[PDB]
């Protein structure tokens, strides 16, 4: 509303709730993605680890950061997968997104564009690299001068020149007709005989006086029209029904929501939602207003997490259940994973629960607060990658009524949902199974990008993978952008940005 | 002030004979009034650490690893019993995280909260990690007082150190204090008692050894040996 | 002794739903309630009435344990018992584990751990 507030000039605002809930939701689709994104923008000192432990592999990807650089003139007229492969193989740079100008609006940030669209002269690609000088070398890349590149040091400055409401008005998100809370509320028995599986459970610690968490920002990314209707993950809220009634009017437009009126700490409610086989579990609190006990706000969250972990089921233990916990204090992260305590005085990123992605801290956004000063575009890329869209015109349309209005299926609407969705794939039974064991990461990335136009992201390697002892621990840690020569075991998940079909 | 006044008066009552002092103490809001209202009931012994229970550096300051136990006291006078219990569980969790191998004893204000201690993987109640629920036991003593009036007083004197004072006057106080000095202990039964029914060995202990045996442990090879209160002649 | 049971498995079952769920009568269930209950008995009209007056505590305890398998606990002696004045006060005080030679008046209650039948 401010006439002089020009976001194009650089005036951008960080919404702490928008981005926190978006990272949490993207963690549901890809476990550990919040930790991976956290290290892309925070300065974190690299410490060499001589021991063959998970910490060394984790810190290998921590030093990698995210930068923006204009693409060279040699890349004009080339498809995104080809230039991405050239940058990765030759320049050792991983390009994620670019800007496409349609001469109708502002150049949107296209996450992993396909081969349908080419690259114009004025493109500012987003790259991931440990240092900054490597990213700069992509600006003056010469195809003729640098045709043969034995090592990346060769490149230098010198060179040779129906009427059914299915989606919203813009089609960016799934939409459904508004429904009264009585259509989605349910009792223990109604939950217990429901066949829901691979769903998302969200436990809320909120009361009449607690503040709104703003759960809309948690629901929108989970259904951003990039997933099929059957592919959408069901969301079940466990908490006080009075609190849910406060902000239900902002969530009644989504197809798959359900609410169970009950305490998150109650084991009966969690068993009735069938949390044993749920795809993801999230713990949120809304009582951050309490002034007493400075380091005690994240009190019920750890109790709920331990209750979930220390819960048995009849055909197993609940430790294997993936849970995401919101922590307001970085000094209570170690209380989550009570299986390995290397040292009580440990860095937040080096802590195992944070590295595994099972714990998230709002402290992380205070670092994004700096990354947008040093590079203005980083916040826009993170927002468009996490929110799954949320164009400024869509933001305006939402602002005009504080709600989502359903649209109609039109050719432009159907073509609008052609972006990429964050997901994880395993090599145990996938097409790359032959490359799962004893295969270089770079070869796998090149094969995936050349075949399925899939941008192979970092590796969510299992913690007990390097050790030869058959450990039964299922906890895994994220490795951000492993090098070309890096090798991965078959029992490793890999993040990806899948296309739409 | 009250909690430490009643704890210290029993822990260091001088009726334990073969014991040391120990008590290190730890708090976060300091002993502002405690130092004038009572000090620590000793000057040379019993110290006070101004560091918190949650901070690992302060927990290292007390050398918790070298302690025999941590004892966690709770304010019965809390506004929210659930909050106080969850804070004490958070304390238990921090202590166990710093050192998995340590005995912890803990006051719980509500019974349903004791279940959360069993969620901690290193919390082994068989090793000795047991929690005292103040409401569980208070209401239990009150209820047992309904069945047997005065049972709460009898059980209170079985475990509290209380000095024995001789009363020459023929009053009820002398008879009452006669049974106050009696305390409760645990001892392994002799090999001569193996294969004998509980009433017979109890009679032998009472008549000969002047000892009153109440309960024993029976191992069924299926679970932990339960505490059988006055077993019959069947077993 | 106080909770009248409360086994750790039962505590876990209670913790799993924060409530009690009714079961069914089974031979193991019926045999489970074979423990002892705390109670009080008087010697005014009980089987030990002949031993109520001028009787040693130890003899009473031995007789009870040998006959009814009843663990004779301490004596809830009336406060105005030693005094010869016929006081009308009904207040009593607990005596914990009186010795073998201790003698009790007939108007005294005794704690006990009765069996089940």
mmCIF file with all atom_site columns, N, CA, C and O in Angstrom, chain B residues 170-205:
data_model
loop_
_atom_site.group_PDB
_atom_site.id
_atom_site.type_symbol
_atom_site.label_atom_id
_atom_site.label_alt_id
_atom_site.label_comp_id
_atom_site.label_asym_id
_atom_site.label_entity_id
_atom_site.label_seq_id
_atom_site.pdbx_PDB_ins_code
_atom_site.Cartn_x
_atom_site.Cartn_y
_atom_site.Cartn_z
_atom_site.occupancy
_atom_site.B_iso_or_equiv
_atom_site.pdbx_formal_charge
_atom_site.auth_seq_id
_atom_site.auth_comp_id
_atom_site.auth_asym_id
_atom_site.auth_atom_id
_atom_site.pdbx_PDB_model_num
ATOM 1   N N  . UNK B 1 170 ? 3.715  -41.358 82.541 1.00 0.00 ? 170 UNK B N  1
ATOM 2   C CA . UNK B 1 170 ? 2.857  -42.405 81.985 1.00 0.00 ? 170 UNK B CA 1
ATOM 3   C C  . UNK B 1 170 ? 1.740  -41.737 81.188 1.00 0.00 ? 170 UNK B C  1
ATOM 4   O O  . UNK B 1 170 ? 0.588  -41.645 81.617 1.00 0.00 ? 170 UNK B O  1
ATOM 5   N N  . UNK B 1 171 ? 2.100  -41.258 80.002 1.00 0.00 ? 171 UNK B N  1
ATOM 6   C CA . UNK B 1 171 ? 1.176  -40.587 79.102 1.00 0.00 ? 171 UNK B CA 1
ATOM 7   C C  . UNK B 1 171 ? 1.195  -41.266 77.738 1.00 0.00 ? 171 UNK B C  1
ATOM 8   O O  . UNK B 1 171 ? 2.022  -42.140 77.462 1.00 0.00 ? 171 UNK B O  1
ATOM 9   N N  . UNK B 1 172 ? 0.259  -40.854 76.880 1.00 0.00 ? 172 UNK B N  1
ATOM 10  C CA . UNK B 1 172 ? 0.191  -41.398 75.529 1.00 0.00 ? 172 UNK B CA 1
ATOM 11  C C  . UNK B 1 172 ? 1.425  -41.057 74.706 1.00 0.00 ? 172 UNK B C  1
ATOM 12  O O  . UNK B 1 172 ? 1.748  -41.785 73.759 1.00 0.00 ? 172 UNK B O  1
ATOM 13  N N  . UNK B 1 173 ? 2.118  -39.965 75.042 1.00 0.00 ? 173 UNK B N  1
ATOM 14  C CA . UNK B 1 173 ? 3.288  -39.561 74.270 1.00 0.00 ? 173 UNK B CA 1
ATOM 15  C C  . UNK B 1 173 ? 4.397  -40.602 74.354 1.00 0.00 ? 173 UNK B C  1
ATOM 16  O O  . UNK B 1 173 ? 5.088  -40.861 73.363 1.00 0.00 ? 173 UNK B O  1
ATOM 17  N N  . UNK B 1 174 ? 4.591  -41.203 75.532 1.00 0.00 ? 174 UNK B N  1
ATOM 18  C CA . UNK B 1 174 ? 5.623  -42.224 75.680 1.00 0.00 ? 174 UNK B CA 1
ATOM 19  C C  . UNK B 1 174 ? 5.338  -43.428 74.790 1.00 0.00 ? 174 UNK B C  1
ATOM 20  O O  . UNK B 1 174 ? 6.223  -43.914 74.074 1.00 0.00 ? 174 UNK B O  1
ATOM 21  N N  . UNK B 1 175 ? 4.096  -43.918 74.814 1.00 0.00 ? 175 UNK B N  1
ATOM 22  C CA . UNK B 1 175 ? 3.733  -45.057 73.978 1.00 0.00 ? 175 UNK B CA 1
ATOM 23  C C  . UNK B 1 175 ? 3.848  -44.713 72.498 1.00 0.00 ? 175 UNK B C  1
ATOM 24  O O  . UNK B 1 175 ? 4.286  -45.543 71.692 1.00 0.00 ? 175 UNK B O  1
ATOM 25  N N  . UNK B 1 176 ? 3.450  -43.496 72.120 1.00 0.00 ? 176 UNK B N  1
ATOM 26  C CA . UNK B 1 176 ? 3.563  -43.079 70.727 1.00 0.00 ? 176 UNK B CA 1
ATOM 27  C C  . UNK B 1 176 ? 5.020  -43.039 70.280 1.00 0.00 ? 176 UNK B C  1
ATOM 28  O O  . UNK B 1 176 ? 5.371  -43.567 69.219 1.00 0.00 ? 176 UNK B O  1
ATOM 29  N N  . UNK B 1 177 ? 5.889  -42.424 71.088 1.00 0.00 ? 177 UNK B N  1
ATOM 30  C CA . UNK B 1 177 ? 7.301  -42.323 70.738 1.00 0.00 ? 177 UNK B CA 1
ATOM 31  C C  . UNK B 1 177 ? 8.017  -43.663 70.811 1.00 0.00 ? 177 UNK B C  1
ATOM 32  O O  . UNK B 1 177 ? 9.094  -43.805 70.225 1.00 0.00 ? 177 UNK B O  1
ATOM 33  N N  . UNK B 1 178 ? 7.450  -44.641 71.523 1.00 0.00 ? 178 UNK B N  1
ATOM 34  C CA . UNK B 1 178 ? 8.047  -45.973 71.537 1.00 0.00 ? 178 UNK B CA 1
ATOM 35  C C  . UNK B 1 178 ? 8.095  -46.570 70.136 1.00 0.00 ? 178 UNK B C  1
ATOM 36  O O  . UNK B 1 178 ? 9.099  -47.174 69.744 1.00 0.00 ? 178 UNK B O  1
ATOM 37  N N  . UNK B 1 179 ? 7.017  -46.412 69.367 1.00 0.00 ? 179 UNK B N  1
ATOM 38  C CA . UNK B 1 179 ? 6.976  -46.891 68.001 1.00 0.00 ? 179 UNK B CA 1
ATOM 39  C C  . UNK B 1 179 ? 7.540  -45.956 66.956 1.00 0.00 ? 179 UNK B C  1
ATOM 40  O O  . UNK B 1 179 ? 7.722  -46.368 65.807 1.00 0.00 ? 179 UNK B O  1
ATOM 41  N N  . UNK B 1 180 ? 7.818  -44.701 67.320 1.00 0.00 ? 180 UNK B N  1
ATOM 42  C CA . UNK B 1 180 ? 8.366  -43.749 66.358 1.00 0.00 ? 180 UNK B CA 1
ATOM 43  C C  . UNK B 1 180 ? 9.779  -44.149 65.949 1.00 0.00 ? 180 UNK B C  1
ATOM 44  O O  . UNK B 1 180 ? 10.148 -44.060 64.771 1.00 0.00 ? 180 UNK B O  1
ATOM 45  N N  . UNK B 1 181 ? 10.589 -44.604 66.910 1.00 0.00 ? 181 UNK B N  1
ATOM 46  C CA . UNK B 1 181 ? 11.976 -44.952 66.623 1.00 0.00 ? 181 UNK B CA 1
ATOM 47  C C  . UNK B 1 181 ? 12.098 -46.102 65.631 1.00 0.00 ? 181 UNK B C  1
ATOM 48  O O  . UNK B 1 181 ? 13.152 -46.252 65.003 1.00 0.00 ? 181 UNK B O  1
ATOM 49  N N  . UNK B 1 182 ? 11.056 -46.914 65.478 1.00 0.00 ? 182 UNK B N  1
ATOM 50  C CA . UNK B 1 182 ? 11.098 -48.009 64.520 1.00 0.00 ? 182 UNK B CA 1
ATOM 51  C C  . UNK B 1 182 ? 11.145 -47.472 63.094 1.00 0.00 ? 182 UNK B C  1
ATOM 52  O O  . UNK B 1 182 ? 10.409 -46.549 62.735 1.00 0.00 ? 182 UNK B O  1
ATOM 53  N N  . UNK B 1 183 ? 12.019 -48.059 62.282 1.00 0.00 ? 183 UNK B N  1
ATOM 54  C CA . UNK B 1 183 ? 12.195 -47.680 60.888 1.00 0.00 ? 183 UNK B CA 1
ATOM 55  C C  . UNK B 1 183 ? 12.062 -48.924 60.017 1.00 0.00 ? 183 UNK B C  1
ATOM 56  O O  . UNK B 1 183 ? 11.871 -50.038 60.512 1.00 0.00 ? 183 UNK B O  1
ATOM 57  N N  . UNK B 1 184 ? 12.170 -48.730 58.705 1.00 0.00 ? 184 UNK B N  1
ATOM 58  C CA . UNK B 1 184 ? 11.955 -49.789 57.730 1.00 0.00 ? 184 UNK B CA 1
ATOM 59  C C  . UNK B 1 184 ? 13.225 -49.999 56.917 1.00 0.00 ? 184 UNK B C  1
ATOM 60  O O  . UNK B 1 184 ? 13.834 -49.030 56.449 1.00 0.00 ? 184 UNK B O  1
ATOM 61  N N  . UNK B 1 185 ? 13.620 -51.260 56.753 1.00 0.00 ? 185 UNK B N  1
ATOM 62  C CA . UNK B 1 185 ? 14.841 -51.611 56.044 1.00 0.00 ? 185 UNK B CA 1
ATOM 63  C C  . UNK B 1 185 ? 14.574 -52.803 55.134 1.00 0.00 ? 185 UNK B C  1
ATOM 64  O O  . UNK B 1 185 ? 13.526 -53.451 55.208 1.00 0.00 ? 185 UNK B O  1
ATOM 65  N N  . UNK B 1 186 ? 15.541 -53.084 54.264 1.00 0.00 ? 186 UNK B N  1
ATOM 66  C CA . UNK B 1 186 ? 15.492 -54.219 53.352 1.00 0.00 ? 186 UNK B CA 1
ATOM 67  C C  . UNK B 1 186 ? 16.717 -55.094 53.576 1.00 0.00 ? 186 UNK B C  1
ATOM 68  O O  . UNK B 1 186 ? 17.831 -54.585 53.734 1.00 0.00 ? 186 UNK B O  1
ATOM 69  N N  . UNK B 1 187 ? 16.512 -56.411 53.592 1.00 0.00 ? 187 UNK B N  1
ATOM 70  C CA . UNK B 1 187 ? 17.623 -57.329 53.797 1.00 0.00 ? 187 UNK B CA 1
ATOM 71  C C  . UNK B 1 187 ? 17.331 -58.651 53.102 1.00 0.00 ? 187 UNK B C  1
ATOM 72  O O  . UNK B 1 187 ? 16.195 -59.128 53.116 1.00 0.00 ? 187 UNK B O  1
ATOM 73  N N  . UNK B 1 188 ? 18.361 -59.230 52.490 1.00 0.00 ? 188 UNK B N  1
ATOM 74  C CA . UNK B 1 188 ? 18.204 -60.514 51.824 1.00 0.00 ? 188 UNK B CA 1
ATOM 75  C C  . UNK B 1 188 ? 17.974 -61.622 52.844 1.00 0.00 ? 188 UNK B C  1
ATOM 76  O O  . UNK B 1 188 ? 18.632 -61.678 53.886 1.00 0.00 ? 188 UNK B O  1
ATOM 77  N N  . UNK B 1 189 ? 17.028 -62.506 52.538 1.00 0.00 ? 189 UNK B N  1
ATOM 78  C CA . UNK B 1 189 ? 16.707 -63.604 53.437 1.00 0.00 ? 189 UNK B CA 1
ATOM 79  C C  . UNK B 1 189 ? 17.820 -64.647 53.446 1.00 0.00 ? 189 UNK B C  1
ATOM 80  O O  . UNK B 1 189 ? 18.510 -64.866 52.447 1.00 0.00 ? 189 UNK B O  1
ATOM 81  N N  . UNK B 1 190 ? 17.992 -65.288 54.599 1.00 0.00 ? 190 UNK B N  1
ATOM 82  C CA . UNK B 1 190 ? 19.012 -66.312 54.752 1.00 0.00 ? 190 UNK B CA 1
ATOM 83  C C  . UNK B 1 190 ? 18.644 -67.564 53.960 1.00 0.00 ? 190 UNK B C  1
ATOM 84  O O  . UNK B 1 190 ? 17.479 -67.812 53.637 1.00 0.00 ? 190 UNK B O  1
ATOM 85  N N  . UNK B 1 191 ? 19.669 -68.360 53.643 1.00 0.00 ? 191 UNK B N  1
ATOM 86  C CA . UNK B 1 191 ? 19.457 -69.596 52.899 1.00 0.00 ? 191 UNK B CA 1
ATOM 87  C C  . UNK B 1 191 ? 18.648 -70.618 53.687 1.00 0.00 ? 191 UNK B C  1
ATOM 88  O O  . UNK B 1 191 ? 18.062 -71.523 53.083 1.00 0.00 ? 191 UNK B O  1
ATOM 89  N N  . UNK B 1 192 ? 18.606 -70.501 55.016 1.00 0.00 ? 192 UNK B N  1
ATOM 90  C CA . UNK B 1 192 ? 17.808 -71.417 55.821 1.00 0.00 ? 192 UNK B CA 1
ATOM 91  C C  . UNK B 1 192 ? 16.312 -71.199 55.638 1.00 0.00 ? 192 UNK B C  1
ATOM 92  O O  . UNK B 1 192 ? 15.524 -72.097 55.956 1.00 0.00 ? 192 UNK B O  1
ATOM 93  N N  . UNK B 1 193 ? 15.905 -70.036 55.137 1.00 0.00 ? 193 UNK B N  1
ATOM 94  C CA . UNK B 1 193 ? 14.499 -69.718 54.927 1.00 0.00 ? 193 UNK B CA 1
ATOM 95  C C  . UNK B 1 193 ? 13.980 -70.180 53.571 1.00 0.00 ? 193 UNK B C  1
ATOM 96  O O  . UNK B 1 193 ? 12.782 -70.040 53.303 1.00 0.00 ? 193 UNK B O  1
ATOM 97  N N  . UNK B 1 194 ? 14.847 -70.719 52.715 1.00 0.00 ? 194 UNK B N  1
ATOM 98  C CA . UNK B 1 194 ? 14.424 -71.167 51.394 1.00 0.00 ? 194 UNK B CA 1
ATOM 99  C C  . UNK B 1 194 ? 13.550 -72.405 51.534 1.00 0.00 ? 194 UNK B C  1
ATOM 100 O O  . UNK B 1 194 ? 13.893 -73.351 52.255 1.00 0.00 ? 194 UNK B O  1
ATOM 101 N N  . UNK B 1 195 ? 12.413 -72.406 50.840 1.00 0.00 ? 195 UNK B N  1
ATOM 102 C CA . UNK B 1 195 ? 11.489 -73.519 50.901 1.00 0.00 ? 195 UNK B CA 1
ATOM 103 C C  . UNK B 1 195 ? 10.510 -73.483 52.050 1.00 0.00 ? 195 UNK B C  1
ATOM 104 O O  . UNK B 1 195 ? 9.801  -74.472 52.268 1.00 0.00 ? 195 UNK B O  1
ATOM 105 N N  . UNK B 1 196 ? 10.444 -72.381 52.791 1.00 0.00 ? 196 UNK B N  1
ATOM 106 C CA . UNK B 1 196 ? 9.540  -72.240 53.922 1.00 0.00 ? 196 UNK B CA 1
ATOM 107 C C  . UNK B 1 196 ? 8.454  -71.226 53.592 1.00 0.00 ? 196 UNK B C  1
ATOM 108 O O  . UNK B 1 196 ? 8.702  -70.244 52.885 1.00 0.00 ? 196 UNK B O  1
ATOM 109 N N  . UNK B 1 197 ? 7.250  -71.472 54.103 1.00 0.00 ? 197 UNK B N  1
ATOM 110 C CA . UNK B 1 197 ? 6.135  -70.568 53.865 1.00 0.00 ? 197 UNK B CA 1
ATOM 111 C C  . UNK B 1 197 ? 6.356  -69.241 54.581 1.00 0.00 ? 197 UNK B C  1
ATOM 112 O O  . UNK B 1 197 ? 7.065  -69.161 55.588 1.00 0.00 ? 197 UNK B O  1
ATOM 113 N N  . UNK B 1 198 ? 5.742  -68.189 54.039 1.00 0.00 ? 198 UNK B N  1
ATOM 114 C CA . UNK B 1 198 ? 5.916  -66.850 54.601 1.00 0.00 ? 198 UNK B CA 1
ATOM 115 C C  . UNK B 1 198 ? 5.458  -66.737 56.052 1.00 0.00 ? 198 UNK B C  1
ATOM 116 O O  . UNK B 1 198 ? 6.183  -66.119 56.853 1.00 0.00 ? 198 UNK B O  1
ATOM 117 N N  . UNK B 1 199 ? 4.290  -67.257 56.460 1.00 0.00 ? 199 UNK B N  1
ATOM 118 C CA . UNK B 1 199 ? 3.920  -67.137 57.882 1.00 0.00 ? 199 UNK B CA 1
ATOM 119 C C  . UNK B 1 199 ? 4.923  -67.771 58.831 1.00 0.00 ? 199 UNK B C  1
ATOM 120 O O  . UNK B 1 199 ? 5.204  -67.202 59.894 1.00 0.00 ? 199 UNK B O  1
ATOM 121 N N  . UNK B 1 200 ? 5.491  -68.923 58.469 1.00 0.00 ? 200 UNK B N  1
ATOM 122 C CA . UNK B 1 200 ? 6.417  -69.606 59.368 1.00 0.00 ? 200 UNK B CA 1
ATOM 123 C C  . UNK B 1 200 ? 7.702  -68.806 59.552 1.00 0.00 ? 200 UNK B C  1
ATOM 124 O O  . UNK B 1 200 ? 8.169  -68.613 60.682 1.00 0.00 ? 200 UNK B O  1
ATOM 125 N N  . UNK B 1 201 ? 8.291  -68.332 58.452 1.00 0.00 ? 201 UNK B N  1
ATOM 126 C CA . UNK B 1 201 ? 9.519  -67.551 58.555 1.00 0.00 ? 201 UNK B CA 1
ATOM 127 C C  . UNK B 1 201 ? 9.249  -66.219 59.247 1.00 0.00 ? 201 UNK B C  1
ATOM 128 O O  . UNK B 1 201 ? 10.091 -65.716 60.000 1.00 0.00 ? 201 UNK B O  1
ATOM 129 N N  . UNK B 1 202 ? 8.071  -65.631 59.019 1.00 0.00 ? 202 UNK B N  1
ATOM 130 C CA . UNK B 1 202 ? 7.723  -64.394 59.711 1.00 0.00 ? 202 UNK B CA 1
ATOM 131 C C  . UNK B 1 202 ? 7.618  -64.613 61.216 1.00 0.00 ? 202 UNK B C  1
ATOM 132 O O  . UNK B 1 202 ? 8.108  -63.798 62.006 1.00 0.00 ? 202 UNK B O  1
ATOM 133 N N  . UNK B 1 203 ? 6.984  -65.715 61.631 1.00 0.00 ? 203 UNK B N  1
ATOM 134 C CA . UNK B 1 203 ? 6.907  -66.033 63.053 1.00 0.00 ? 203 UNK B CA 1
ATOM 135 C C  . UNK B 1 203 ? 8.291  -66.283 63.637 1.00 0.00 ? 203 UNK B C  1
ATOM 136 O O  . UNK B 1 203 ? 8.587  -65.848 64.756 1.00 0.00 ? 203 UNK B O  1
ATOM 137 N N  . UNK B 1 204 ? 9.149  -66.988 62.897 1.00 0.00 ? 204 UNK B N  1
ATOM 138 C CA . UNK B 1 204 ? 10.506 -67.234 63.377 1.00 0.00 ? 204 UNK B CA 1
ATOM 139 C C  . UNK B 1 204 ? 11.276 -65.930 63.547 1.00 0.00 ? 204 UNK B C  1
ATOM 140 O O  . UNK B 1 204 ? 11.989 -65.747 64.541 1.00 0.00 ? 204 UNK B O  1
ATOM 141 N N  . UNK B 1 205 ? 11.144 -65.012 62.588 1.00 0.00 ? 205 UNK B N  1
ATOM 142 C CA . UNK B 1 205 ? 11.830 -63.728 62.689 1.00 0.00 ? 205 UNK B CA 1
ATOM 143 C C  . UNK B 1 205 ? 11.298 -62.900 63.852 1.00 0.00 ? 205 UNK B C  1
ATOM 144 O O  . UNK B 1 205 ? 12.074 -62.253 64.565 1.00 0.00 ? 205 UNK B O  1
#
